[model samples]
Target: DCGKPQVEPKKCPVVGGCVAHPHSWPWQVSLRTRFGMHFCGGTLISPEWVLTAAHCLEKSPRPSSYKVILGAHQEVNLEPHVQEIEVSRLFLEPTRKDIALLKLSSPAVITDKVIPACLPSPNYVVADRTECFITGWGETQGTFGAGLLKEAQLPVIENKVCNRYEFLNGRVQSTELCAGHLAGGTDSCQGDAGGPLVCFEKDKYILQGVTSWGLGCARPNKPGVYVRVSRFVTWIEGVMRNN
Candidate 1:
């Protein structure tokens, strides 16, 4: 089932990032350099399409130089279930939306350990205070763990209110979303960029946001900002349809 992980994440917290259950976030993907270095997080939106941040590859947007790793819980160790594939194309949105889509050279074989994340309906809004989780192999407090997957629960912060924060004043745009604690201690940090900000809905984890940017990682009053996925459903569909 899409977005329905086979296991439950360890009852946790990303700056406050807790190690996640192996394959609990089945759609979670590790976007790495072709040489096998973990760099950014991505979501498997479909068997052949991956969703991530455009900035993740903007510096050197070479599809051949990158790879997508699926069903991986540990970044450095070899795993039997992991599926590694070459990125054949990069479809970065040509707008302020920080979204991008990567076409896998081959469709990932679907199994309990690898599935797609659900997309939100157009114009949908995740209610304020909803407990959504951001999972990635990112750093915590500027330190890296054993290359394990990490997850943190952040409450959805209303855009209008989030934009009111002195650090973020008027910077949150209509095409973006915000989520994190008002006080510090939790957030999506470096390497978490291009990951999915998934929230539970009707027993499914729907991808509501794409980790975009923030004033700083988990600083008080500076909630993390993301590309509101609902705003680009049409664009995503168009690209998927034509390609």
Candidate 2:
């Protein structure tokens, strides 16, 4: 999972102390409710598959009850590249893995504005302090999320040390990746769950993690934890193959 991205600093907008991204994050997605509510973020892994959080599907979304919005910058812009596709299947990891794979009802119209994010290899390990970024329409104001896309620059932290933080209560698992500033400030919030935690590898950005949970967004020493993508690469591929 390496090579130069189609474009870096790519545009798409969502949360943090968040701001508008410039197409740098072409794979970002909005998993919306039937009535157009933005509840979670996802990554376009292919024209027909997406990666997200299993908890997002705890309610069992139907093929028509939800939609996947690719290349969405604003809530209502509906640009030519903004795709509204239905869910065909949801593959949740049986354990508390927290990650899931989604199959779209139909293949997407892949274009420059919409492309698949590269997935990490089975043994990929993101070194601690490596530069990374998280993007989403998570928290805009108060408890509500954003209306457009937004992004934030964060760093990867070691899992064991991150688990020692006061907030987690010893719950961080081997399958999770912890990332954020210990000082507290920028991070993915509520709706940002299931979004990408991307980092550079072999000259390209790889999907290293999937937003899972945290004590709270950007709180002191409470870095957000994600489903380590490398840890579940086999599981992800197996599910996609079997489905």
Candidate 3:
């Protein structure tokens, strides 16, 4: 079922064109659980791996019933570039990592139109005030519930500034990245969780973070939060190596 009101075609801005600079890899994934219910929204990382929020798998617990859809632009017309794959295993972190790695039954077929995104280096650190792109099919404005997948660009905020927010102060960790305008025009919402916070650096589109949580969708004084990629590089590599 579709959530929220239909976004006017003219209202929905082109990711890289009108809002944020689109990365080379911009894709959304939908994962269905064993019971047939589907939880949508994820990003392609490697041919065999997908990056998503751990909460997406929290209740399902089993990987057998899961399937992923890549390169989906619309929810209804999901035939093109749709690759169905069984989830092999789930690699999660010890603490509240908020990030999960999904192993595909087989590697995704790569082409000029579809490719995996680059992960951040261990030492990679996004400087304060850097602008990054946030994309999702989340809610819009005052409405709630998941909306059509869309994207927006926002600026990275300093850790101190982020920490000052009451909602984020204790929950937000060092291994997290915060971005949003204090004036509050752009942000990530419900459906956007587990999507990518991508930045173009050194001639490559690097995944700087994964959408985790925010105080609320596009609220002033509160910003979107993401799982810091650099901090989880070891966990990601280990998952890939062992799997």
Candidate 4:
């Protein structure tokens, strides 16, 4: 049942992208500061656990300093389906600098509007050029903030091709993923760090990456970098198993 959108995932064919339906992206969550400011994004992987980039909390690692907002579309709005929960714990990947898992202080209420995202099997490979999507309330058109959730479809770019960009100097690691336009004009920005990069499969969406970094927002030859989820599935499973 995970990753099945309540509303169909529509194709974003516009110049930049389009706003997602209120609850269309069931697993999307906003990682907000305790003071009610959203700084990054995350995905609900279970009723009590969230998956995001470890770097999301590097500045403020305390569990009590942040909250996770589920079933939200607008950055600031009261919706019946919105579920806000405090984080009880945080577990960062030992070797990977960008992966992290958070334990919610309490289990989130599962409903038609709130659910978890499906995780890819360990070492599973998504074919190059496969179409995938990313969603966030990140900046839009060079603006500092976005009021509503927006989505953009980006194709998977091979690591080799991504590394070929001289500016990258071969920094595209096998443990990471690259997806976006080589020609630029579209991508996840500053506020979107830690967001999910998901690809649809036979019947559900599979989380393939975690938004990590980029040379610059939507710049030519500078595709966005993501922590490849498949590479960390074993570590993730172990963490969720023991803690």
Candidate 5:
């Protein structure tokens, strides 16, 4: 029962992202804009902390400009059974680490329906071809909220195979992890940033990556790139304690 999901996932429906079972990802969050627009996806590291991409907050640095909605079944602006919290305490990253942390204005009540995700340790390294999944909201056919949270099963692609892309500008360092279909299609696009790239391991689910960037969404050979969360495990903890 260790690796079992909180809520079982439904059979694959959409090609890229299918609707997930209700409350399937207890830690998944919708990081929204000031006026209740979907800005990006996020994962709850703890009741008081959220792990997201630095780029998500790049243009909008003010804490008051964002919001976090937890335990969501629907993607609506004000959905039911949804826990809304203010976003603040951004773990300041200066070197473009492509990662950031947000402190919740209020702590979430611990429960089967609301829990923190397990973050991978510093030494954790995922092998190529391992199965992982990314979840988010309204993409492809509709506007923001369909109230159906979508997830896609993906394979962890190695850098050697994905390094051929010239858009990377340089080497694909450990700070980044590449995963996508080498043949193309099925990758995270707009409104998918800051989401979870989780791999089930050791009978438990550990968040191994964050939705970072890629040259184009689902381009042949150019897989989706994510900020390797395990690489910054130390930094994340330090910020958690200091801030």
Candidate 6:
């Protein structure tokens, strides 16, 4: 019953819908290297760098084991954006900071179709209850194996509401944001971890969050959680500049 066909209620207990929702912006890539496999979702921050979850590179894997492919609509597609790059270096935040910086072997070719996502400037704050989008190739349930990358739009829950969860007590740091169905349904699964939670502003899009962790996929009372992008802006910039 985990992967059962999603049914829509009169009102979304969670803010987002299924994979076909228009608000979902789906262009990030997930990389699995030989050293260690962790979910790190990336947004085209620059031609030479991708913004992702720091945990993805925490173990220090051999760069040669890394490979990246984009433009995949389905897992079965043999011809995806198969680009090989050595992870030159990674930038990670201090404890409680989940953002990371990935330097590519070479600059990614950018086109109108494949462009970098805008980062939120200083002074920008994503208000509570605002809608944001997430996309990934992760599992639909607790299961594993790749599926077509999918997107879902959900509303941001206030920090107070998230803190109300007994398990998240003191664990939900300032660097993280929480969203999901209080009643349970839409969520980010395994492979989807480390992906982007995007928000649109004035016809432009900005990455507001990164997939971090959750109790489980779409579990009742367990909403999806993410790394708050705004909290680590300075850390991200410092890493990029120093590296």
Best lDDT among the predictions, by candidate number: 1
Give all TM-scores, in the order shown.
Answer: 0.95, 0.90, 0.83, 0.95, 0.89, 0.80
Rank list by lDDT: 1, 4, 2, 5, 3, 6
Per-residue lDDT of candidate 5, residues 1-243 (tens digit) = 222456655545512656677787888889998788887998888889998888899887789898998888677645566788997667756577888899988997766666778988796778889889888873544323345677778888766665655435455776788887767667777777898998878677789999988777766767789998888999888888887
Compute the lDDT of residue 238 as modeled in candidate 5: 89
lDDT of 3 by residue, 135-218 (tens): 665555543223234566678886777887453676667899888776665677765678888776755567888898887766
Native-referenced Cα lDDT, model 1: 0.88
Select the stronger candidate by TM-score from 2 and 6. Answer: 2
Which wins on lDDT, candidate 1 or candidate 6?
Answer: 1
Residue 76 of model 6 has an lDDT of 45
TM-score of 4: 0.95
**Residue 76 in model 4: lDDT:** 85
- 41: Cα error in model 4, Å: 0.1
How many residue pairs clash (N, CA or C atoms closer than 3 angstroms) in each of the candidate models, in the order given? 1, 13, 4, 1, 2, 2
The better-scoring model by TM-score among 1 and 5 is: 1
Q: Write the per-residue lDDT of candidate 2 for residues 1-243, one digit (tens) a residue.
A: 222345567422423455555356778888988888889999988778899998887775565676899877776666775788988877778786798888999998876668888888896778889878888878754533457677777878877677674646678888888888888767788888999988866666789889988886777888889889998888888888877
- 1-243, model 4: which lDDT tens digit per residue? 788877776776412567876787889889999999989999998899999889899988799998999988778885766898999999989995698999999999988788899999999877889999988888787433368888889999888877884546699889998889878888888778888999999999999999999888888888899999999988888888998
Off by over 4 Å in 2: 1-4, 10-17, 141-145, 165-169
Model 5, stretches more than 4 Å misplaced? 1-5, 10-15, 141-147, 165-171
Q: Write down the lDDT of every candidate, Cα atoms only.
A: 0.88, 0.78, 0.68, 0.86, 0.77, 0.63
Which of candidates 3 and 6 reaches a greater lDDT?
Answer: 3
RMSD of each: 1.5, 2.8, 6.3, 1.9, 2.8, 6.8
